[PDB]
Amino acid sequence: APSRNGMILKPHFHKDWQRRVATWFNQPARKIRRRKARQARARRIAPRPAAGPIRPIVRCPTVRYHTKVRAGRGFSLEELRVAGIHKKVARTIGISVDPRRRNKSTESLQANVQRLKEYRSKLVLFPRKPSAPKKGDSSAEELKLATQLTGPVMPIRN
Amino acid sequence: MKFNPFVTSDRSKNRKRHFNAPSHIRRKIMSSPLSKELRQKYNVRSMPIRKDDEVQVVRGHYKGQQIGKVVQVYRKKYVIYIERVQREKANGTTVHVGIHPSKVVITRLKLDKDRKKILERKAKSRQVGKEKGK
Amino acid sequence: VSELAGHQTSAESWGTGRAVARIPRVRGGGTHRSGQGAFGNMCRGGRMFAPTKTWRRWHRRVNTTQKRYAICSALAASALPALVMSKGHRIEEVPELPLVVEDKVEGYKKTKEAVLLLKKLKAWNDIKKVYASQRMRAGKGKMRNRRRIQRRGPCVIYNEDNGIVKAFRNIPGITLLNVTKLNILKLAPGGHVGRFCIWTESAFRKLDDLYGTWRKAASLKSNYNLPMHKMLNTDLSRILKSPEIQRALRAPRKKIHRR
RNA sequence: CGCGACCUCAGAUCAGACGUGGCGACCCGCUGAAUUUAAGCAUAUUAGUCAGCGGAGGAAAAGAAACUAACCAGGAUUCCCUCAGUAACGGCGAGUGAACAGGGAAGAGCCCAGCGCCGAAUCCCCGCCCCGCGGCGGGGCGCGGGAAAUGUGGCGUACGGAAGACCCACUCCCCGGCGCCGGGGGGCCCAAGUCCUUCUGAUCGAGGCCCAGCCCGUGGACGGUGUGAGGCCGGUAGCGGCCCCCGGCGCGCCGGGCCCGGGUCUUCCCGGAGUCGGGUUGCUUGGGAAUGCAGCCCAAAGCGGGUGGUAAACUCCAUCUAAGGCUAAAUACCGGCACGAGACCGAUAGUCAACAAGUACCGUAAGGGAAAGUUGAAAAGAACUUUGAAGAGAGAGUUCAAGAGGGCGUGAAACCGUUAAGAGGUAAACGGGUGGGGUCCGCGCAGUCCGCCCGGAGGAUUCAACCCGGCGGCGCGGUCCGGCCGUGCCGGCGGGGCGGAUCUCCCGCUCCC
RNA sequence: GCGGGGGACCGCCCCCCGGCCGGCGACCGGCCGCCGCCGGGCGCAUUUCCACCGCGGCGGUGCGCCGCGACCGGCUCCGG
RNA sequence: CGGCGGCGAUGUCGGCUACCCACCCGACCCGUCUUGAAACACGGACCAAGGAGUCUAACACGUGCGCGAGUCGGGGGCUACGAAAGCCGCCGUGGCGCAAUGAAGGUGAAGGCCGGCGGCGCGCCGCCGGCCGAGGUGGGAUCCCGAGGCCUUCCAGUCCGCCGAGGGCGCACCACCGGCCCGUCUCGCCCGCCGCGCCGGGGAGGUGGAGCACGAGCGCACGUGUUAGGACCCGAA
RNA sequence: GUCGUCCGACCUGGGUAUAGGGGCGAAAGACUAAUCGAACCAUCUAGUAGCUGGUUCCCUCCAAAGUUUCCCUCAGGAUA
RNA sequence: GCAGUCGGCAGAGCGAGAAAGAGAGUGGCGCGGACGCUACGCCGCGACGAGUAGGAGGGCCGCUGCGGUGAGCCUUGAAGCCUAGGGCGCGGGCCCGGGUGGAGCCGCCGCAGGUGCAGAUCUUGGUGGUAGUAGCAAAUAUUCAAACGAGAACUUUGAAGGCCGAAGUGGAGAAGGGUUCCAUGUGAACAGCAGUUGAACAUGGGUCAGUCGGUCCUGAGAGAUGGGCGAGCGCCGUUCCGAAGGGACGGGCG
RNA sequence: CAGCGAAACCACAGCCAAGGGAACGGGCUUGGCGGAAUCAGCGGGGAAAGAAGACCCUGUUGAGCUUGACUCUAGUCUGG
RNA sequence: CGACUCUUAGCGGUGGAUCACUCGGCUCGUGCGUCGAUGAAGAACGCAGCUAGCUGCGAGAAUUAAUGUGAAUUGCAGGUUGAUCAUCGACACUUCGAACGCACUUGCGGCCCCGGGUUCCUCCCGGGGCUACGCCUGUCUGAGCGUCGCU
Ligand SMILES: [Mg+2]
Ligand SMILES: [Mg+2]
Ligand SMILES: [Mg+2]
Ligand SMILES: [Mg+2]
Ligand SMILES: [Mg+2]
Ligand SMILES: [Mg+2]
Ligand SMILES: [Mg+2]
Ligand SMILES: [Mg+2]
Ligand SMILES: [Mg+2]
Ligand SMILES: [Mg+2]
Ligand SMILES: [Mg+2]
Ligand SMILES: [Mg+2]
Ligand SMILES: [Mg+2]
Ligand SMILES: [Mg+2]
Ligand SMILES: [Mg+2]
Ligand SMILES: [Mg+2]
Ligand SMILES: [Mg+2]
Ligand SMILES: [Mg+2]
Ligand SMILES: [Mg+2]
Ligand SMILES: [Mg+2]
Ligand SMILES: [Mg+2]
Ligand SMILES: [Mg+2]
Ligand SMILES: [Mg+2]
Ligand SMILES: [Mg+2]
Ligand SMILES: [Mg+2]
Ligand SMILES: [Mg+2]
Ligand SMILES: [Mg+2]
Ligand SMILES: [Mg+2]
Ligand SMILES: [Mg+2]
Ligand SMILES: [Mg+2]
Ligand SMILES: [Mg+2]
Ligand SMILES: [Mg+2]
Ligand SMILES: [Mg+2]
Ligand SMILES: [Mg+2]
Ligand SMILES: [Mg+2]
Ligand SMILES: [Mg+2]
Ligand SMILES: [Mg+2]
Ligand SMILES: [Mg+2]
Ligand SMILES: [Mg+2]
Ligand SMILES: [Mg+2]
Ligand SMILES: [Mg+2]
Ligand SMILES: [Mg+2]
Ligand SMILES: [Mg+2]
Ligand SMILES: [Mg+2]
Ligand SMILES: [Mg+2]
Ligand SMILES: [Mg+2]
Ligand SMILES: [Mg+2]
Ligand SMILES: [Mg+2]
Ligand SMILES: [Mg+2]
Ligand SMILES: [Mg+2]
Ligand SMILES: [Mg+2]
Ligand SMILES: [Mg+2]
Ligand SMILES: [Mg+2]
Ligand SMILES: [Mg+2]
Ligand SMILES: [Mg+2]
Ligand SMILES: [Mg+2]
Ligand SMILES: [Mg+2]
Ligand SMILES: [Mg+2]
Ligand SMILES: [Mg+2]
Ligand SMILES: [Mg+2]
Ligand SMILES: [Mg+2]
Ligand SMILES: [Mg+2]
Ligand SMILES: [Mg+2]
Ligand SMILES: [Mg+2]
Ligand SMILES: [Mg+2]
Ligand SMILES: [Mg+2]
Ligand SMILES: [Mg+2]
Ligand SMILES: [Mg+2]
Ligand SMILES: [Mg+2]
Ligand SMILES: [Mg+2]
Ligand SMILES: [Mg+2]
Ligand SMILES: [Mg+2]
Ligand SMILES: [Mg+2]
Ligand SMILES: [Mg+2]
Ligand SMILES: [Mg+2]
Ligand SMILES: [Mg+2]
Ligand SMILES: [Mg+2]
Ligand SMILES: [Mg+2]
Ligand SMILES: [Mg+2]
């Protein structure tokens, strides 16, 4: 029964909710395990950056967010084509690839192309056989000054 | 303070592990300190006791400077029996009373080759600690 | 408690008739547990009233400004000699209460250097009081892994750990804290302000960047400044007997007019 | 007729393998209620829930768009926060109820069929030899047998692909064996008081340990030991030690494989059907003129099809490319193996189960299902004497204690026996008020000190005042000397950090000869 | 032209100074003065300080228990 | 009271209470439902131990704390007790708040004075400029000014403090009147241009709104109340 | 004790068949393991109850209602 | 009402019917003085005090556990429990003395709750009165002597008197029970008195088959494969939508 | 009588008359009065025990059965 | 007075509360994440010098071997060149059970081989190895008025 002036409430507790209650007492355990998996990954890919491959600049859709740019899934094949990077060697030198993504405008295409050309300028590539350097591989000075990068690779700013 | 997350400090777990310990772990629990002269001779503080150590009782009713050999190491009630450490029943027969080896000072070991091997191992690990500290 | 506790029987009430009290009772069998009062908080066996669930709200979030407020207030109280003595720390011979020892002692390794440092800083009497307060706890905490209780000695607060934690951690009552990670639970134990603190020098100097002055915000926090005093002169006696108030007071009526 | 192909179908204790069944906390596929709520009840809700059935794995399922969107567009799946108790559904009542965008955790993609070309270039099995031989694999020889043209393998898959011609450009990936160099299990160990007194049944208690303020302390977690232990013992701490074992990780050798690309132009090629879609029926959904699924009927097309949350026609546009397949991580885990912990419970509690507990016992059966911890420090568990047929006593003995005697720590109350005292025909009991008697208590029983002054004898190297030294408190001592501090300010031939939606010489990058 | 670097400006903060002002009672030193206390001297008993005595006085508090009286004041009930 | 008395060591003093007994007066057995219980209403032979408004979520209001036109890291990440605590700001995504109204398309919270010009017939009915500018009335805690005055032989004569007729600014708040915003209705004249349109904007008067009219919210904690959950505990056919 | 029947629709053992909205019934709603106008076991399930019963320490302060209106309302709510 | 304890830096006022200043300037010896004030405290006046349902406040009331604290208590005796002892508080309750007990416990500030019992035909356990009461009465019946034995109404033996009366109170089997069968010992517990006895308890023993039964057969029926159905575990079906014969004599050949 | 030895039930209990009272008291008021502990009987009383009235009514509680109740459905008839 | 009854105290019984202990739970979290026709899960029956239960084990039966360990086990007996414990990788592992020759009685077979028997010629007895369903690849024997070809 209702009393005087108050809200009409509809609590969704008419099912047997107490079997499927998910407590979070393993929250710092999940956080601590995710942290150790992150440092294990970072230790495994030792000079490659810890967060992962480079992600492109994408405009969010759906007018609430279309002023904001963010990181997309991968560089699109025409962006790699204009940057002159093979779409199978991109994922080997650390470039995210999205085959599914179209371009509709020139400027986002060119901004991600310049991002690719800004990333290959920073890329220090170790030779494939360690006692024999090859044609496009980085020189022994940037090999000795290679470090593991933290955070997103060249993070995206508004 | 213990920091190892695999070693328990739970009272009931420690008590269960102590009172259900198998006999070769019981031997290590039933360990007696050596004498001051035996400490300066072998550089060993503590040793598991055997069926032939000449020992002294230093705590209890049967304490004193008298020396008796261990005659039985009764691992199931965690006690040992020493020679003149006895009491008489109603009927006049003497029985041996149980003494815990922590209240027992060893003044003469049964030196077996196993015992000498254990004594050398304990002395060497103690000296590794002493020469690691500096 | 387990949610199956006391509900692991089949039990029907006998209904009316039978001259018994209408509670559910155990079915059949030749044993003691037969017609013997199964469900309900009032029976032997059976679940308790309102069985405790795991999803009680165990955890309480406090606002970040209030958590820094309490750290500020506990630190501020740990510099007044009356409040720490009312907390019971034996400081009647320490040479200054915000007791800052120089930064060499963060590089300690052995416990004997720590003990000699406390003895020469006259804070060893607090550890001796902690030793005197070592005793067994009254009650079921002894059977619940909390056999021994003891009071708190000082809190050594440091900037960088060059072995001071291992050199001090075997002395009872001493809590080690980094200035970047100051704990209100360890800086006001029991909710009572007045914990004795022994600072190191760089630890002491980083306080004006961790929490700020009033003119400058906190350099090591995002947006935090020191809280503001609701009154600035708290010397009520000095306020009241100052001439400005006394010229405006009326004459006091100090005379007892009984019946 | 007979012989031989092939196809289809049998038989075999033919040769070699594989499945069944269990567990089931988590997961997948079906099937699927009613109690309940609506203050009745039938749609609804409960609930795609319980029960039932099938199938797994260490995760499963899902998963690389026949997608979201309408934006300046995003970009597999899964999970978290928010979206949001919202859009929407609903006897529009009760109630139910998502999705996209956004921020994160994680992050990885790929393969067929089809279309094409390559002397089927492909696969399986038996025989011999050599190796390796406890995951049955590698090399070679078989005018050895089958499979397969009713299509195996190589290239190749919608992000396009292939071939030819022209250019540009390197010879290093991986398999099978093998030896050589520098995390995991298990075992054994590693500091310091039994120091001097003293309490005690026993001390681990209490006091002391000087001029090293007993000793160690990277160890003062815990447990055991006759109360209570950092130092008696096991342990604890430590980038502490040693010995095996199993890996992972590098280099080296033999044999075998693979003898491979990017760009430009030209010429060709390109797709999954009783499936989509329509009607209807039934279930399902927030999906409302039908979200998904399924039955039945109809039944496709290729500048086509699907979607674009209101049925339909015309016309633009956008977005994918269905009817084939694989895929870790984040995610889940009340079963299991091994652990750790606790502001939990403390034997009518906490699991049914602290103990010979899913036991004893009950029911034909499916099933149901208890009660029950504690002598003591140590059995030292009462020898011997005596009564009695004996149980049971009386002595004696052990123990600190039997006032702890083998269902024995503590030993309450109900109830009972006995002793003591008091009482007694309106059942007892009670409230108020006294009185009497007991039990003890007040260790009551010639009763209080305190301050000042007077007197009396007594004692004291003793008061005031002055000298020295130390300590403390208090005119800025108007305007004594110097410092420090200001949620004070002004000045600057000042020397710096931080911030700002305040303005304006070099480098990278993009068109332009 | 883009993005980034450089510079200037502005604000706030920190540190050198030069100057007022305030506080040192959440925060001082030095000397000078006054006081108080402690110690050591000198002082030496009509002073001072101890302990006893009187059934001492003064002022406070209570009497061991059982009692009684006196007046004062308040409230009452009466009576002459 | 600056008044007295008596009794005391093995039989007496005190002990309101506490054990028993005696007597007078009072006095029916509790719990419960009920207009009404001592009831010929039900439960209760006795004793011990157990035994019933909890927790989660939401909302409301009140109160406490912090910050405040903002607030909040709860999810994620970085660095024995500690599974804690500290930090992140180019982790404020996001929630709630700062804006409402309409079914929706949608729209969305003061205006007046001056200089210039019966077009009409904004003297009325727009735009060029400047200025002033967020309403008023009544009450209203506080506060402000002050005709005069608060004595010590008596006239002055100054400063400070206090009191004060009367007059003021008026907090919060209340009541009323205007004003502004969205829906809708009625009347009526204009203003705009890239497209002069079945276009767009404006005014006056009412009226519907959970609005504005110089914020008050957010987070946390506590308390009560109402619910959804086994829901204070036991109970069906 | 007295009774019905006691060569026939007779009595009886063992084996077998039918199982819960089902069986079986010379029919009484009888029987179906002391259970039958729907057996027994476990679960859904701590099913719901406007209806009975109970609901645990002290002191202090304040202190009611059985009336209005609406309700498949009359042993109950909402509202004042 | 009280911060006014405003002291040789002194001057000790502010109850008094009547708005305000115990205001300030300048001209005309002996070293003294109760208490107070946990300001959440203390003090003073006046009025008042019923209470169900219900609401609120204060609890130096109580339980358990946690965080602080008491240089706390404790084997020269903790908790618990008993008490004709002493007391305190309006009360919840608490403190102390005695005794028992034999190892832990409590005060204060906060925190948390599975936190206070006379009831619920409450749950579990224990104990009363009833009460040495009801009762040990269905089927005719026992008596004498002896033995053993600590002990005899009841065991055994003898004698007597009786009953079942061949549809038995006899001799044997089925099913079922499972060692109850047999011998010896015991008399604690049980056999509703007893017991020297037992189907009790404890020690040892005991069941021998070609022909006796099972085994084999088929009955009423149960039930696979085939087949069919079924989401499925599976179900129907039993000669039915089956290539259902693995057998034998003779002949030939090795 | 010897041996053995329960259970139901129980607020406290147990002599009456009248009164009032929840309209038939063992208790209360007013009277009558009242004397240990007991045995065998007995059936007036304890509105005696036995079992949360089965009759009646209420509940927005059911179930068995019926039909011209409401809404469905197996089967069956008929069409495509 | 006594007996009986009531009350209180002391002592003693009955009873097992309270308290103090706690090799047990409950809850949370971490790591691993493994059964079976080579016979699992489960069940039955046995196994110790005295052994009923529990536990351990399987006719090698409270355990065998190997390694680590290093002198016990213990309720009573008896008897370091390795006792006892732990680890467990070697070996073994009765009957049933998916349970597997057919059945469920401990019933009945069949094939092959070995030993007694025989004098392999059968019998008989003992022992060993096989004998279930479905299904895959392959092999062999075949079936068909299925489709052909050849003579
Ligand atoms: Mg209400
Ligand atoms: Mg990451
Ligand atoms: Mg329980
Ligand atoms: Mg306690
Ligand atoms: Mg085969
Ligand atoms: Mg309903
Ligand atoms: Mg209802
Ligand atoms: Mg109903
Ligand atoms: Mg549903
Ligand atoms: Mg299920
Ligand atoms: Mg399976
Ligand atoms: Mg598995
Ligand atoms: Mg998949
Ligand atoms: Mg998505
Ligand atoms: Mg919301
Ligand atoms: Mg639903
Ligand atoms: Mg999204
Ligand atoms: Mg091909
Ligand atoms: Mg291929
Ligand atoms: Mg694709
Ligand atoms: Mg000591
Ligand atoms: Mg210890
Ligand atoms: Mg100990
Ligand atoms: Mg010590
Ligand atoms: Mg040691
Ligand atoms: Mg050690
Ligand atoms: Mg270690
Ligand atoms: Mg539905
Ligand atoms: Mg369209
Ligand atoms: Mg549409
Ligand atoms: Mg495809
Ligand atoms: Mg696909
Ligand atoms: Mg128990
Ligand atoms: Mg207990
Ligand atoms: Mg239990
Ligand atoms: Mg006991
Ligand atoms: Mg004792
Ligand atoms: Mg005892
Ligand atoms: Mg006892
Ligand atoms: Mg007497
Ligand atoms: Mg009377
Ligand atoms: Mg009632
Ligand atoms: Mg009535
Ligand atoms: Mg009553
Ligand atoms: Mg009556
Ligand atoms: Mg009733
Ligand atoms: Mg009753
Ligand atoms: Mg209780
Ligand atoms: Mg609030
Ligand atoms: Mg932890
Ligand atoms: Mg409300
Ligand atoms: Mg309930
Ligand atoms: Mg509730
Ligand atoms: Mg129920
Ligand atoms: Mg019949
Ligand atoms: Mg009838
Ligand atoms: Mg009702
Ligand atoms: Mg009622
Ligand atoms: Mg009152
Ligand atoms: Mg003990
Ligand atoms: Mg609790
Ligand atoms: Mg009770
Ligand atoms: Mg009789
Ligand atoms: Mg008998
Ligand atoms: Mg016999
Ligand atoms: Mg014969
Ligand atoms: Mg069948
Ligand atoms: Mg008799
Ligand atoms: Mg009566
Ligand atoms: Mg009376
Ligand atoms: Mg009668
Ligand atoms: Mg009734
Ligand atoms: Mg009834
Ligand atoms: Mg009704
Ligand atoms: Mg019905
Ligand atoms: Mg007990
Ligand atoms: Mg061996
Ligand atoms: Mg060995
Ligand atoms: Mg048979």
From Swiss-Prot, chain A:
GO molecular function term, any single one: RNA binding
Modified-residue entries (Phosphoserine), positions: S76, S105
Highest taxon above the source species: Eukaryota
Cross-link (Glycyl lysine isopeptide (Lys-Gly) (interchain with G-Cter in SUMO2)): K122, K144
Protein's cellular compartments: Cytoplasm
Residues with the N6-acetyllysine modification: K15
This protein's UniProt keywords: Acetylation, Cytoplasm, Isopeptide bond, Phosphoprotein, Ribonucleoprotein, Ribosomal protein, Ubl conjugation
Keyword Isomerase annotated: no
Cellular component annotations (GO), alphabetically ordered: cytosolic large ribosomal subunit
Example of a GO biological process term: translation
Physiological role: Component of the ribosome, a large ribonucleoprotein complex responsible for the synthesis of proteins in the cell. The small ribosomal subunit (SSU) binds messenger RNAs (mRNAs) and translates the encoded message by selecting cognate aminoacyl-transfer RNA (tRNA) molecules. The large subunit (LSU) contains the ribosomal catalytic site termed the peptidyl transferase center (PTC), which catalyzes the formation of peptide bonds, thereby polymerizing the amino acids delivered by tRNAs into a polypeptide chain.
Subunit-level organization: Component of the 60S large ribosomal subunit (LSU).
Assigned protein family: Belongs to the eukaryotic ribosomal protein eL13 family.
UniProt protein name: Large ribosomal subunit protein eL13
From Swiss-Prot, chain B:
Entry keyword set: Cytoplasm, Isopeptide bond, Phosphoprotein, Ribonucleoprotein, Ribosomal protein, Ubl conjugation
Alphabetical list of PROSITE patterns matching this protein: RIBOSOMAL_L24
Presence of the UniProt keyword Ubl conjugation in the record: yes
GO cellular component, one term: large ribosomal subunit
Primary location class: cytoplasm
Region (Disordered): 1-21
CDD domains: KOW_RPL26
Location of this chain's protein in the cell: Cytoplasm
PTM (free text): Ufmylated by UFL1 in response to endoplasmic reticulum stress, promoting reticulophagy of endoplasmic reticulum sheets.
Single GO term (MF): structural constituent of ribosome
SUPFAM superfamilies tied to this protein: Translation proteins SH3-like domain
Coiled coil ranges: none
Biological-process GO terms, alphabetical: translation
Gene3D superfamilies for this protein: 2.30.30.30
Function: Component of the large ribosomal subunit. The ribosome is a large ribonucleoprotein complex responsible for the synthesis of proteins in the cell.
Homology family: Belongs to the universal ribosomal protein uL24 family.
Entry protein name: Large ribosomal subunit protein uL24
Origin organism lineage: Eukaryota, Metazoa, Chordata, Craniata, Vertebrata
From Swiss-Prot, chain C:
Positions of post-translational Omega-N-methylarginine modification: R44
GO molecular function list: structural constituent of ribosome
Localization: Cytoplasm
Record's comment on post-translational modification: Citrullinated by PADI4.
Residue(s) carrying Phosphoserine: S237, S242
GO cellular component terms listed in the entry, alphabetical order: cytoplasm; ribonucleoprotein complex; ribosome
Modified residues (Phosphothreonine): T213
Modified sites of kind N6-acetyllysine: K53, K206
Domain of life: Eukaryota
Position(s), cross-link Glycyl lysine isopeptide (Lys-Gly) (interchain with G-Cter in SUMO2): K186
Residues recorded with modification Citrulline: R247
Keywords: Acetylation, Citrullination, Cytoplasm, Isopeptide bond, Methylation, Phosphoprotein, Ribonucleoprotein, Ribosomal protein, Ubl conjugation
One GO term (biological process): translation
Main location: cytoplasm
Binding partners and assembly: Component of the large ribosomal subunit. May bind IPO9 with low affinity. Interacts with RBM3.
Family: Belongs to the universal ribosomal protein uL4 family.
Cited function: Component of the large ribosomal subunit. The ribosome is a large ribonucleoprotein complex responsible for the synthesis of proteins in the cell.
Name the UniProt record assigns to this protein: Large ribosomal subunit protein uL4
Organism: Oryctolagus cuniculus (Rabbit)
Gene: RPL4
Residue range from the parent sequence: 54 to 312 of 413
